[PDB]
Amino acid sequence: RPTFYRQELNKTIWEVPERYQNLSPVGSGSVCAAFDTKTGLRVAVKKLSRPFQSIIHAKRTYRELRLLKHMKHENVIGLLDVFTPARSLEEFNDVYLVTHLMGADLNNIVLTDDHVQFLIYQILRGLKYIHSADIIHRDLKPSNLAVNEDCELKILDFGTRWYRAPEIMLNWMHYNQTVDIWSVGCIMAELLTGRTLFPGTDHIDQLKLILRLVGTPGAELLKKISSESARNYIQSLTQMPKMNFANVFIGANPLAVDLLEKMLVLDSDKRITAAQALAHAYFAQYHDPDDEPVADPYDQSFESRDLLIDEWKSLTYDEVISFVPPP
Ligand SMILES: Fc1ccc(-c2n[nH]cc2-c2ccncc2)cc1
Ligand SMILES: Fc1ccc(-c2n[nH]cc2-c2ccncc2)cc1
Fold first, then answer.
1. Which CATH class, in words, describes the domain spanning 104-294?
2. Which of 91, 132, 168, 238 has a CA positioned 20 to 30 A from the CA of residue 320?
3. Has 157 been annotated as catalytic?
4. Which terms in the GO cellular component ontology are assigned?
5. Superfamily name with CATH number, domain 14-103
6. Domain ranges in the chain?
7. How many alpha carbons lie under 13 Å from residue 296 in its C-beta half-sphere?
């Protein structure tokens, strides 16, 4: 077992192997930029807040570790290392996650059309992989998109309101992966105009703003809504038509406009998928079918289990010990 050293940073206690030096806060568990003396690389170390404060925390802790250990793709945060100072399950109460250090995030940056292309391309490439594993991000937003100096991008926190799919603004329990495509659409639009596409003040205001652009629900989509209250609410609002994106985003690359219309489609069943988007002409310059990999199967069966805190903890502990660094 490696040698750990203790230190305090912003009222938070950090106990990490000596291979990690020069820890310095970068954001919020908590994250510290650091230097890995074994690899010689700059990394980001995240310390989970209270990994086992409750069954929910315990399971959440397990879920994140499982997800990170599975993600092995250039455009997705991956695990360089995971560790705990604990020498045994008995005293196991802290979890640290390590990944390559990424300079900033999209929320920080803001772009020209060429930059948007490369950035959105990467998001979609990462999303294809994630979605092929039957995983849905559910909370894609600028702050969850890490980018380094090279404009290389990685998706973070698979886990505000502005990038949430409309079906989610409503309470639809059966939304699918396409909710992530909607978020991309909002993000892309933001990168092109420099303004939040739908800055809703609340669930009602948010949905209101969305329908103003994409128009109110047609008959085919209306047929798919089981909730009576959802229908009363929706069908009572002032009917509005889908707007001409060419006019709304006028001046922008016509190809970008085409893609946006395909992403920001109200009916989730009609939204372009990540795989299809990568083939869209907007990404002609970057698209390569032989270099847009899918992920191995991801076992999500644990999600339906109701276990004790100690069982989730022990499950997590086992995942820490079984971890094998990347090549
Ligand atoms: F293992 C991990 C997993 C996630 C993080 C992280 N969470 N929020 C932001 C980051 C982050 C910050 C800087 N560079 C890469 C990732 C850090 C280490
Ligand atoms: F006003 C709206 C906003 C979004 C939707 C929607 N898009 N994809 C799926 C749905 C949806 C919402 C609620 N119940 C079933 C399906 C339907 C009506």
1. mainly alpha
2. 132
3. yes
4. cytoplasm; cytosol; extracellular region; ficolin-1-rich granule lumen; glutamatergic synapse; mitochondrion; nuclear speck; nucleoplasm
5. Phosphorylase Kinase; domain 1 (3.30.200.20)
6. 14-103, 104-294
7. 6
